[PDB]
Amino acid sequence: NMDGRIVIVDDEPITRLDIRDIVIEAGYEVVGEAADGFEAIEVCKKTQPDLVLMDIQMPILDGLKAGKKIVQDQLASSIVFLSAYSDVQNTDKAKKLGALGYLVKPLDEKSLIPTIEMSIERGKQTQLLLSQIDKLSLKLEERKIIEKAKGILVKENHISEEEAYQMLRTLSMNKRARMSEIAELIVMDD
Amino acid sequence: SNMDGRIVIVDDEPITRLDIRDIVIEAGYEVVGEAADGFEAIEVCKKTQPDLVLMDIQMPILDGLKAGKKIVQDQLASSIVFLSAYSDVQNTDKAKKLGALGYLVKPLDEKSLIPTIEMSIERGKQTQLLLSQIDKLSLKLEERKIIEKAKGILVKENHISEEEAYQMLRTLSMNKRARMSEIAELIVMDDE
RNA sequence: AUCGGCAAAGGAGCCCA
RNA sequence: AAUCGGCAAAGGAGCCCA
Ligand code: BEF
Ligand code: BEF
């Protein structure tokens, strides 16, 4: 049966429990619940769920603004709204902040589980791309700092690039630290 | 009022294609084509390059899942949303794996369609931005090896520091307003 | 005297019970 | 001497067009 970790957010517990039944029957893990945007933020912060289901109209903080915080900080992998509100203002706001689905009340208990599976998977793949972008842009920070470190080290010692790389390689290995970090220190040095 | 987006509709029951067509046009979208089987679905996407594809699973010739895989992996459309009576667990696994952005179930809840369209269009665009940023970084990381040769040539020929040689190459490439890789190619062939 | 980890792999160093 | 746009940098503040 289905696999995924889910957080449920609505101010009306009646709807919150309808969802809770459907989702657990399908076999997901319901890890937390919230009745307002602040409980929702703190629950996600602790939880790190795969999906957050939430209503726009809540007390304290509408799901739009709480969702904005959730996605900005990356407290959850994917987020899907459901509300009886579907005016274009709320639709644009939800799509801009980065929702992966939006369902209109009263919810289609038939569509829900499929849209859950889609939103979880596309959430994961989006997190993979962000990690690949992070990894590449880091490696491209590293080579710049490394090349600066080669240059400054050659200027101070008056030696060749092979010896400069050998110095960085021996230091990083001896000191159990990335050549990139050693280079950042040496470049800050001058 | 006045939604923007370009859509293609794909189902074997023409009554449902017309019900959908009427809804999306009333919202303000542009329908740019329709199909009634997987083979026309791929061909229409090749021509139109739409923002969103709406398709049933059970279609003749090529099930919507097979056309959906092709459309996604060749990027013939920026986002894709299924709409079927089939909610079968195997069908949801296939649809999410190939790369759907939504999976509504027949008979459709018309209220829900337009929001899921807007979300799926935006998520499709954003996913293509991220893929473009990956292509740009990985290219610029390959340019580095040519730039590192051009740097080495400057430090020898001028008899200067690495930080001075890069500062020269950068100020040159900005002055001549050309990609450092292009200036690096010119220098490295000039030494040859 | 032995196990484990980080770094390097343009390698073969370092730390811990 | 200034502003609009564009190219390139971003290991940054540089260059072209009205
Ligand atoms: F508060 Be939800 F919009 F029912
Ligand atoms: F008729 Be399709 F399978 F929804």
Residue numbers in the entry:
A (entry chain A): 0 to 189
B (entry chain B): -1 to 190
The authors write:
ANTAR domains are a class of antiterminator that bind and stabilize dual hexaloop RNA motifs within the nascent RNA chain to prevent terminator loop formation. EutV possesses one of the most common domains architectures found among all ANTAR proteins annotated in the Pfam database, consisting of an N-terminal phosphor-sensitive REC domain (aa 1–119) coupled to a C-terminal ANTAR domain (aa 141–186) via a coiled-coil domain. Ethanolamine (EA) stimulates the histidine kinase EutW (component 1) to phosphorylate EutV (component 2) which promotes homodimerization of the protein. Dimeric EutV acts as an antiterminator of RNAP by binding these dual hexaloop motifs within the nascent mRNA chain inhibiting T-loop formation and thereby preventing transcription termination.
Additional density present at Asp 54 on both chains indicated successful incorporation of BeF3– and activation of EutV. Unambiguous electron density for a single RNA hexaloop was present at the ANTAR domain of each EutV chain. The dual hexaloop RNA molecule was bridging between two asymmetric units within the crystal lattice with each hexaloop contacting a symmetry-related ANTAR domain of EutV in the neighbouring ASUs. In total, each ASU contains an asymmetric dimer of EutV and two RNA hexaloops from different RNA molecules. As a result, chain a and b make more interactions with the P2 RNA hexaloop than P1. Both sites bind a single hexaloop with the conserved G4 of each loop flipping outward to form π–π stacking interactions with Tyr164 of the ANTAR domain. The G4 of P2 is coordinated by hydrogen bonds to Arg142, Lys149 and Glu160 of chain b, however, Arg142 from chain a is unable to make the same contact with P1 (compare A and C). Intriguingly, residues Lys143 and Lys147 from chain a contact the P2 RNA, through hydrogen bonds to the phosphate and ribose respectively, representing the only interactions between an ANTAR domain and the RNA hexaloop located on the opposite protein chain. Asn173 and Arg175 hydrogen bond with hydroxyl groups of the ribose sugars of the bases that form the stem of the hexaloop, and Arg177 makes a hydrogen bond to the phosphate backbone of the base at position 2 of the hexaloop. Unexpectedly, given its hydrophobic nature, Met172 is positioned in the middle of the hexaloop of the RNA hairpin and may act as a hydrophobic plug to position the hexaloop on α7 within the ANTAR domain and flip the G4 base out of the hexaloop. Nevertheless, there is a break in symmetry of the homodimer upon RNA binding due to a larger flex in the coiled-coil of chain b, between Ile139-Glu141, than for chain a.
